[PDB]
């Protein structure tokens, strides 16, 4: 059991406190350092598992040794001594630039920093595949690849006497949260007048019991049997956008299509949902164009009316109906038009606040 001198330290984030204790639990003991220092001195390979019975294996990597061993030593009696030194000097300056880039002042908090294995690539000689094989990763299936690339390292010791850096890594494994379902949403444009709109919803959302959440797909890979994320991906969704996804069409915002098109059609549940006011739709089975009722905004094409449909020049066979026949636009409460460009947001918010400050003087005088 250890205690932190909080009055002495004065200030620290939870992240710094836990990493600091972790630093104490995982750093090598003072004489394992002297042993490690001596093992490093007597080796000459680019990568080497340093095994001292009793103690755990320590993986040692030397970032320019392959170049020395493969390129400089075989030239030792064919190039001058000056030239050999000039060749290595160029490598050392390029390697120092990477050490500086990763461990220099751009590293804000060395105690709680977690460095991805890929960011260590150059410090480890320009490639990480041999490191991963020595740790047991085969490269034989995509999941092990994703896990191996999710390794993060913490600095546990910096030796200024013998110039080495000890890092501690942990192995990623998959933690399935069975109550969370990730959903990919995809929209088609529809026409109101001469304006072409689409509903603004996120590309990915998550359901979690009562909750609908935002989903950050940045750190995720959509494997065939699950979404694999190397970091937490769930984030709050405002109640209004949740209400939109729960069926309140008036809560969903909409915007005009960029350029001159949307996605005017989509295959979903074996049916074609299509903006047939904006593209040519045609029944292939009968040869007859498919017109969109003008007080409807979309067409839901299934095999009960057209087994094989042509849509913007593409011929698609469809299945039985899984989406009702379109209803009249007047039976749909459309939500507010919006823009997502940040300057448009700021200009419209400034106007709204100004209109609201006017309104702030009028409703006390009459009341």
């Amino acid at each position: 059991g250890v205690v932190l001198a909080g009055a002495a330290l004065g200030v620290a984030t939870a992240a710094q406190i836990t990493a600091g204790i972790a630093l104490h639990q995982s750093m090598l003991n003072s004489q394992a350092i002297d042993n490690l220092r001596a093992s490093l001195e007597t080796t000459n390979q680019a990568i080497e598992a340093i095994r001292q019975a009793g103690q755990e294996m320590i993986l040692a990597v030397q970032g320019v040794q392959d170049y020395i061993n493969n390129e400089l030593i075989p030239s030792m009696n064919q190039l001058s001594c000056d030239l050999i030194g000039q060749k290595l000097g160029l490598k050392l300056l390029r390697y120092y630039t990477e050490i500086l880039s990763l461990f220099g002042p751009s590293l804000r908090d060395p105690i709680s920093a977690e460095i991805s294995i890929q960011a260590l690539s150059y410090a480890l000689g320009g490639d990480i595949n041999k490191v991963l094989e020595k740790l047991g990763y085969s490269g034989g299936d995509l999941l092990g690849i994703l896990e191996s690339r999710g390794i993060k390292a913490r600095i546990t010791h910096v030796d200024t006497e013998s110039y080495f850096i000890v890092l501690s890594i942990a192995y990623p494994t998959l933690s399935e949260i069975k109550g969370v379902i990730v959903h990919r949403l995809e929209g088609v444009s529809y026409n109101i007048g001469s304006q072409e709109w689409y509903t603004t919803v996120p590309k990915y959302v998550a359901t979690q019991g009562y909750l609908i959440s935002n989903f950050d797909e940045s750190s995720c890979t959509f494997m065939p049997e699950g979404t694999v994320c190397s970091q937490n991906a769930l984030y709050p969704m405002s109640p209004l956008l949740q209400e939109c996804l729960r069926g309140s069409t008036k809560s969903c915002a909409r915007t005009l299509v960029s350029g001159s098109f949307g996605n005017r059609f989509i295959l979903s549940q074996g049916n074609l949902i299509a903006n047939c006011a904006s593209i040519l739709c045609k029944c292939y089975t009968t040869g007859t164009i498919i017109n969109q009722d003008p007080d409807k905004i979309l067409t839901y094409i299934a095999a009960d009316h057209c087994p094989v449909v042509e849509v913007n020049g593409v011929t698609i066979q469809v299945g039985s109906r899984r989406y009702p026949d379109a209803v009249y636009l007047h039976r749909i409460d459309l939500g507010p038009p919006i823009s997502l460009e940040r300057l448009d947001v700021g200009t419209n918010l400034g106007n709204a606040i100004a209109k609201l400050e006017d309104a702030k003087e009028l409703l006390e005088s009459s009341d």
Partner: protein, 81 residues
Amino acid sequence: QIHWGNLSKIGVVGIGSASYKVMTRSSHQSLVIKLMPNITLLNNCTRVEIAEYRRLLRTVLEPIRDALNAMTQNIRPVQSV
């Protein structure tokens, strides 16, 4: 929870669901970056370059060593209270 019918009336559909798996880190393994290469088979031909490399490294390594010592010197075993 999500209402696919009403969303389809305004052109939004779901095109796939999946379970959600997050990576959690466990166990531990020590990795050491050996900054100083073995140059013995180069017979003193890189002595100037190596010494300069070492000097550049010190500027980078000393602040990190100092930052790590600043934390662990405030971490004592429980009975010091």
